[PDB]
């Protein structure tokens, strides 16, 4: 179909691709600069389709198929002439139906798929080819057809339903494993790609798929089973309820696989994953079935015993360092599975089945089962905390006896649990089980025990210490410390390292109680450092945490020598980060005396925090293996593939956070760096579209930088620059969580910069940003079923409220004008609770600045509704609005405020209860506002009602009004309720009303005055003396 000249030019080029730099680079330029142009592109696509279809050379065929796939997207296929699309399609199809190597048929299939499209003409020859190939006796034809149905799931819609059903059923049951896997993959891909409204049309095939599964175990084809479990895992995340009717059968099947422990791990790990993922996607369904929980606990307990296989003494485990053995695959998987399901389902549902088994495993003569027991509890404790936090003596009764098990791995197991639960049941467990936990861990520290066990116990003392007060640790310190010094003398590096960190963290919790241990510890530490990088880092960490615990005066006995060692250490990669945190901690200890060390510490942080977005424009194939590295990720942004060096950008964050924390501590003393950090780090960081941590860390740096310069023209320039990039980010930023940080960052910027810190264009550009943010939140939220059982959004709206309020205040009202343009938006929200709360909160801010009449009619009907809402947050925002009406718009509002006033006397009356103490306090303030505005114009029972709502202890601005009103009830024997109403507010720290009160007590004898405080305990009488 091509001129013969064109053919050997193109042939030469494509053949040059395999090869030398010269021949191959000349071809590369030729292709990209000469052949992919409006004028040659169709010739090029025609050629490549011909080669892939007909070439007898493997390499040329393959390459052309790949190239065609790549270039056919870019063209794109849509702007190709009809006569040439047709010809390309026809040859691609003839190639597919001819004799090709498997991998070329795969590449042809991928090329064919690029030629099937919404706006492209119908290709009914494809449809026909796929149906016939599916019946071919050649697996490669069957497999390749399902591969095309995977790339282009719309084709499945286009075949008659009575053909496509038997196609998949024959597919699931095919003699070829490869065809099975491709059938499964195409079947699940359909649900991946199509709207839910199309799902019911293949959904009916699920039981045929599930019914095909036992055959994989009959044939002993477990690797193939694993891949099918993988597709099934993706189907659970898309349509868990499709599994409802056969739920027991899948549970029992996964059970059966995992028990067959001659199977290789992949079938067993993916089976477990399939089990696990129901708890994440259909928690009601798992909970409505006692079998799920029982099987899930049983099979993770089986897998947790699979340790030290063929090594009963644990010699290998005893002899190694305190890391995980990465050969213990099923055991690792079982621990994260139990944890994951516990976290989803809660203890109400799993503790019973869990405990049924543990009671029994604790007593086995198989050590593996006694260990399993401890590790299973360790996995489940957090998710089951709601129940287990109450059964804490019972748990210690089981665990603590094992601390002395003959087998050192069971001992390590028990250390593990005491550690895990010191975290998960904190702070309650530190208060109530210190007397059992500490002696138990401390007994393992002795050099009688194995290195692994001493180390594990020392690690568990970090978990305990984290949430133990200095007073609880105090009687245990000398004993803790004398033991850990012995650990410090071990011959094993990892015991020393753990010893050091354990002492550091105990010292952190001990605080000033650690002062007496400083003189024994500090020289031991100095000696280690003067002499094993990690040891030195953990040692400097230990020293500076001891520093922070004992305070600056005591830290001064060794600070200069310690600082000189740091210097030597820094200027000489796990080390880097211990060094930087230690400098940062010295800054917290020394305060302003750190200032002379800034030139040592800051420059290296400047370098790291200037890191650029290190991107590599990359190719499809050349990814995946790039992805292997934990330090790289690849994403698709606009069609193309990009490799981004993630670690480097994480390090840029880390450095930005340290700069941020120096700037926060040093305030005006950091000013010298502000310009440079702002222009070279904070601001360019907002443009880092490939890493959101950077963008957020850039945003939080902004207000802090400004505030440093403030405390020490530029300020105004930088603020203008920074606010404008913040504003601009609001219309472009794709991630809602980042959007939030920008609003918060504006709010904090405004708070720093003060009055009228914004210009008119900025106020207008902010409005558009606020509107686009509101528009996209609406859109995402009007998207939340047959198949299935967002604080992110709530939080973003929370902050938008703050920024609007903040902008209103800095403009001193003038932002009302701009605010008018998004009123339709606001109004839709007002009439789904999160959108409502938002809108009410906005309107309360509006009124704060009688020019709102324009909207009285548009909102009070819904606000009055909201007053009696079942949701406390709605009532709260509602009443605030009614109260603010009478405060700032007294007169354009009365026909409303006085009517509602009875509503408020009722909302006022589970009122005084934690959950809604806040809502009823606003109503209370709201009625006091009405009573003020229209003072002796009111039809007075009211005020005596209002009174019985005192005290106001939770909402501060409410309390502030109520006691202002209280200060404008008299005499009587209301007197002790009058006073206490005030003592309560003060003591609870929610709120000159004192002056008013002392006047009332003036009107009574010596003895009558005194007696009122007679009820108050010593501590609040100390305060009352200092108040009156």
């Amino acid at each position: 179909a091509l001129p013969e000249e064109v053919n050997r030019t193109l042939l030469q080029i494509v053949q040059a691709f395999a090869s030398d730099n010269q021949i191959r680079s000349v071809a590369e330029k030729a292709l990209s600069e000469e052949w992919i142009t409006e004028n040659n592109i169709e010739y090029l696509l025609t050629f490549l389709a011909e080669q892939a279809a007909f070439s007898q050379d493997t390499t040329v065929a393959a390459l052309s198929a790949v190239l065609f796939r790549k270039l056919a997207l870019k063209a794109p296929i849509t702007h190709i002439r009809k006569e040439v699309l047709a010809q390309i399609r026809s040859s691609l199809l003839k190639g597919f139906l001819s004799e090709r190597a498997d991998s070329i048929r795969h590449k042809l299939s991928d090329a064919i798929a690029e030629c099937v499209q919404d706006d492209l003409p119908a290709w009914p020859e494809l449809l026909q080819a796929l149906i016939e190939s599916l019946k071919s006796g050649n697996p490669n034809f069957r497999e390749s057809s399902f591969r095309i149905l995977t790339t282009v799931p719309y084709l499945i819609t286009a075949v008659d339903i009575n053909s496509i059903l038997p196609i998949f059923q024959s597919g699931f049951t095919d003699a070829s494993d490869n065809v099975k896997i491709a059938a499964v993959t195409a079947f699940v891909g359909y649900f991946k790609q199509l709207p839910k409204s199309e799902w019911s049309k293949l959904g009916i095939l699920l039981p045929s798929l599930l019914n095909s599964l036992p055959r994989f175990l009959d044939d002993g084809k477990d690797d193939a089973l694993a891949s099918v479990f993988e597709s099934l895992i993706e189907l659970v995340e898309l349509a868990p309820k499709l599994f409802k009717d056969m739920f027991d059968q899948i549970i029992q099947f996964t059970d059966m696989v995992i028990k067959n422990k001659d199977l290789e791990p992949p079938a067993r790990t993916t089976a477990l994953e399939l089990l696990t993922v129901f708890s994440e996607n259909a928690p009601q369904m798992c909970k409505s079935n006692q079998n799920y929980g029982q099987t899930l606990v049983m099979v993770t307990l089986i897998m947790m015993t699979e340790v030290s296989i063929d090594d009963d003494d644990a010699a290998e485990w005893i002899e190694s360092d305190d890391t995980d053995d990465e050969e213990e695959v099923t055991y690792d998987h079982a621990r994260q599975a139990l944890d994951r399901v516990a976290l989803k389902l809660g203890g109400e549902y799993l503790a019973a089945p869990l405990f049924q088994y543990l009671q029994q495993m604790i007593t086995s003569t198989e050590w593996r089962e006694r260990f399993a027991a401890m590790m299973a509890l360790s996995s489940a404790a957090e998710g089951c905390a709601d129940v287990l936090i109450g059964e804490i003596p019972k748990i210690l009764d089981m665990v603590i006896p094992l601390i002395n098990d003959p087998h050192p791995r069971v001992q390590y197991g028990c250390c593990n649990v005491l550690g895990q639960i010191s975290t998960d049941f904190s702070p309650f467990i530190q208060r109530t089980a210190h007397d059992r936990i500490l002696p138990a861990l401390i007994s393992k520290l002795t050099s009688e025990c194995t290195s692994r066990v001493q180390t594990h116990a020392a690690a568990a003392l970090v978990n305990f210490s984290e949430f133990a007060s200095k007073d609880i640790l105090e009687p245990y310190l000398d004993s803790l410390l004398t033991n850990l010094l012995v650990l410090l003398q071990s011959n094993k590096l990892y015991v020393q390292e753990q010893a050091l960190t354990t002492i550091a963290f105990i010292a952190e919790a001990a605080k000033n109680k650690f002062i007496k241990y400083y003189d024994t510890l500090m020289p031991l530490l100095l000696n280690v450092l003067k002499v094993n990088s990690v040891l030195k880092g953990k040692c400097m960490e230990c020293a500076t945490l001891i520093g922070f615990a004992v305070g600056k005066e005591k830290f001064h006995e060794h600070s200069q020598e310690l600082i000189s060692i740091l210097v030597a250490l820094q200027n000489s990669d796990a080390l880097r980060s211990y060094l930087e945190q230690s400098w940062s901690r010295i800054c917290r200890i020394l305060g302003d005396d750190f200032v002379p060390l800034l030139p040592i510490v800051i420059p290296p942080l400047l370098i790291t925090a200037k890191a650029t977005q290190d991107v590599g424009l990359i190719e499809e194939e050349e990814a995946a293996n790039f992805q292997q590295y934990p330090d790289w990720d690849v994403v698709q942004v606009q069609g193309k593939h990009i490799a981004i060096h993630t670690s480097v950008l994480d390090d840029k964050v880390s450095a930005m956070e340290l700069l941020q924390s120096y700037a926060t501590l040093l305030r005006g003393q950091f000013a010298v760096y502000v310009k440079e950090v702002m222009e070279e780090i904070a601001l360019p960081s907002l443009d880092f579209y490939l890493h959101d941590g950077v963008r957020a860390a850039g945003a939080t740096l902004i207000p802090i930088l400004l505030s440093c310069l403030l405390a020490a023209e530029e300020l105004v320039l930088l603020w203008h620059k920074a606010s404008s990039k913040l504003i601009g980010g609001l219309m472009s930023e794709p991630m809602p969580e980042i959007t939030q940080v920008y609003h918060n960052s504006l709010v904090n910027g405004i708070k720093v910069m003060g009055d009228n810190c914004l210009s008119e264009d900025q106020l207008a550009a902010f409005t558009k940003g606020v509107s686009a943010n509101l528009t996209d939140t609406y859109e995402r939220m009007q998207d939340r079923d047959e198949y299935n059982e967002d604080f992110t959004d709530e939080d973003l709206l929370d902050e938008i409220n703050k920024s609007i309020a903040a902008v209103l205040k800095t403009t001193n009202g003038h932002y009302l004008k701009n605010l008018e343009n998004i009123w339709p938006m606001i109004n839709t929200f007002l009439l789904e609770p999160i959108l409502v709360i938002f809108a009410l909160v906005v309107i309360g801010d509006l009124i704060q600045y009688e020019q709102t009449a324009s909207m009285k009619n548009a909102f009070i009907p819904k606000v009055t509704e909201c007053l009696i809402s079942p949701d406390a947050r709605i009532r709260q925002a509602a009443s605030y609005i009614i109260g603010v009406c009478a405060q700032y718009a007294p007169s354009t509002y009365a026909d409303v405020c006085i009517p509602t006033l009875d509503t408020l006397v009722q909302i006022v009356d589970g009122s005084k209860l934690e959950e809604n103490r806040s809502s009823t306090e606003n109503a209370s303030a709201a009625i006091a506002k009405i009573l003020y505005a229209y003072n002796s114009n009111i039809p007075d029972t009211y005020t005596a009602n209002w009174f019985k709502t005192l005290p106001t202890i939770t909402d501060k601005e409410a309390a502030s009004f109520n006691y202002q009103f209280l200060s404008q009830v008299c005499a009587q024997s209301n007197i002790s309720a009058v006073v206490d109403s005030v003592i309560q507010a003060l003591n609870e720290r929610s709120l000159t009303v004192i002056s008013s009160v002392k006047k009332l007590l003036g009107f009574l004898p010596s003895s009558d005055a005194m007696a009122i405080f007679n009820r108050y305990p010593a501590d609040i009488m100390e305060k009352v003396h200092k108040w009156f």
Binding site: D324, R335, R340, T423, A460, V462
Partner: peptide, 12 residues
């Protein structure tokens, strides 16, 4: 990690 903690989740 120099305290007790759980292994990282293995999903996607």
């Amino acid at each position: 990690s120099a305290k007790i903690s759980k292994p990282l989740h293995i999903k996607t």
